[PDB]
Amino acid sequence: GIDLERNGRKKKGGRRTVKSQNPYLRLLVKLYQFLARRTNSRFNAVVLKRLMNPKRLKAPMSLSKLARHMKGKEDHIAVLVGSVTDDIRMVHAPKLTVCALRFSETARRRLEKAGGECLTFDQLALRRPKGSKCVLLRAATKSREADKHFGAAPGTPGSKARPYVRSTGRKFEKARGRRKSRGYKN
């Protein structure tokens, strides 16, 4: 008999465990939750959380973007809880020393040839338990087909949301609403 809001008992919104049945990812988390709990460094606490993320937050960073975040800071190990893709536009790949979950086989060839080390996360623990002189990165989350559609809903004044439309070009959602000559602009 308490005047309490929800008598909370209030839950936490973020994910509380690993969802994968991938056994290697589970053992990765067991490492980095021993290492988070015991070591005290905030690097390991963040890496633990980012390991448990779903696929759309483990988004691929290109080799050419990974150059330019790591530009002034050449010595430091470039961590990315995520995948690493080759940039085809990048002609001469810079050497770096990357850690990540997964390299595509082009990007593994391109770094290793260019004089450039290519680590897993369990190897990063042996070198750098604290995360001393590392660079956390992550690929942009809101940069995909699906996330163009979100926001204020396309027929409202000054939204930049895409409509869900079956096909492109005229004859599809380009008349009443989109022209002033057809009723109204909005």
Binding site: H149, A153, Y164, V165, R166
Partner: peptide, 9 residues
């Protein structure tokens, strides 16, 4: 027709 989906075809 409800919500934001594609108009069905």
């Amino acid at each position: 027709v409800s919500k934001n989906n594609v108009l069905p075809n």
